Structure formats: structure tokens, C-alpha cells
């Protein structure tokens, strides 16, 4: 399905360390994060997405329309300008973040009552899994 709506609660988080190190996040921000549950809320209506991810540490909030290129300041993360574009490849939601870092983006998809998210930067991949709540 392409319907990614709802409230999603994290059940695993693989190599978030490596992904953050690839983005040049200070050792201490990485220490704080590294581990910590999370809730992602996706409100999607056709191509229009409003997403909230929440942790006890920092929020990162992302709204976009699929197929409409937009400039992203990645505020919560690594302090950067990117040209972000979100598109569909089959039922996989794909974001390419163009700028200094190579191979920067993410891919998100649904299989069952789970949401899967693969965050990439350079040679690094972080894999998250969420359950619908
Ligand atoms: C690095 C980092 C974070 C992660 C940010 C990410 C990976 C956001 C991805 C959002 C997506 C892919 C939304 C798509 O719908 C947090 C949690 C703010 C904690 C502080 C450090």
C-alpha cells in the first residue's frame, strides 16, 4: 500500500550511530540519541504529507507534497541545506536529499501493521521499524 497514515511507535533502530556519524553530528549529540523510543505521526491525504517524529530529546518535523521539490534545512540534525524531493517507486516512498553528502535520503514503506524506514548517508544505512499504534 501507499497509505502510510497513522501513529507509529518505534520497535527497532539499527545503526542510527553510523548514520549520525556520517552526517558529522557531534559525539555528544550521538551519545544522547543513539537509543530512545519514538513516535512518528503521518497524516497523508493523497500526495500531501504532514509528518511528526517525536522523542524525549528532539523533534524533526517534515511536511511535503510528493513530486514537488522543496528546499530542506535539516535543523534538528546536522545543520544543512538540501534540495529534497519525495517520490514513489512502486509502494516505496523515496526521498533524495541533494547537497554535499552523497547518497543522502531515505526510503519508507509499509508491510502489514509495520512502517519501515531506511535512512542513508554516504556509505551508512540506518534501518528503523515502527508498529502502528
Ligand atoms: C539524528 C537525530 C534525529 C533524527 C532525525 C531523523 C532521522 C528524521 C527523519 C524523518 C523522516 C524520514 C520523516 C519522513 O516522513 C532526532 C530523532 C531528531 C534526534 C536528534 C538527532
| Domains of the chain by residue range | 1-133
* Dihedral sign, Cα of residue 10, residue 127, residue 80, residue 57: positive
Q: Is 108 annotated as a binding residue?
A: yes
User: For residue 96, what are the contacts with CB-CB under 8 A and spacing of at least 6?
Assistant: 84, 85, 87, 104, 105
Residue nearest to atom 19 of ligand 1 (CA): 58
Q: Is 15 in the pocket of ligand 1 (CB under 6 A)?
A: no
CA distance 64 to 47: 8
Q: Give which of 6, 7, 5, 2 is closest to 87, Cα–Cα.
A: 2
Q: Which atom of ligand 1 is nearest to the CA of 57?
A: 19
Distance CA 94, CA 132 (A): 20
Resolution in A: 1.6
- Do residues 125 and 118 lie in contact, with contact meaning Cβ atoms separated by under 8 Å? yes
- Cα(125)–Cα(104) distance, integer angstroms: 10
Instruction: Give domain 1-133's CATH superfamily.
Output: Calycin beta-barrel core domain (2.40.128.20)
Rounded to whole angstroms, the Cα distance separating 65 from 128 reads: 23
Experimental technique of record: X-ray
d(CA 103, CA 3): 26
Among 21, 27, 77, 108, the mutation site with the greatest number of ligand 1 atoms within 8 A of its Cβ is: 77
Amino acid at each position: 500500500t501507499r497509505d502510510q497514515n497513522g501513529t507509529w511507535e518505534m520497535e527497532s533502530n539499527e545503526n542510527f550511530e553510523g548514520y549520525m556519524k556520517a552526517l558529522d553530528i557531534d559525539f555528544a549529540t550521538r551519545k544522547i540519541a543513539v537509543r530512545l523510543t519514538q513516535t512518528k505521526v503521518i497524516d497523508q491525504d493523497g500526495d500531501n504529507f504532514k509528518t511528526k517524529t517525536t522523542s524525549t530529546f528532539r523533534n524533526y518535523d517534515v511536511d511535503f507534497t510528493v513530486g514537488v521539490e522543496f528546499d530542506e534545512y535539516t535543523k534538528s540534525l546536522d545543520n544543512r541545506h538540501v534540495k529534497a524531493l519525495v517520490t514513489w517507486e512502486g509502494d516505496v516512498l523515496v526521498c533524495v536529499q541533494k547537497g554535499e553528502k552523497e547518497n543522502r535520503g531515505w526510503k519508507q514503506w509499509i508491510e502489514g501493521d509495520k512502517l519501515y524506514l531506511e535512512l542513508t548517508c554516504g556509505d551508512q544505512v540506518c534501518r528503523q521499524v515502527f508498529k502502528k499504534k
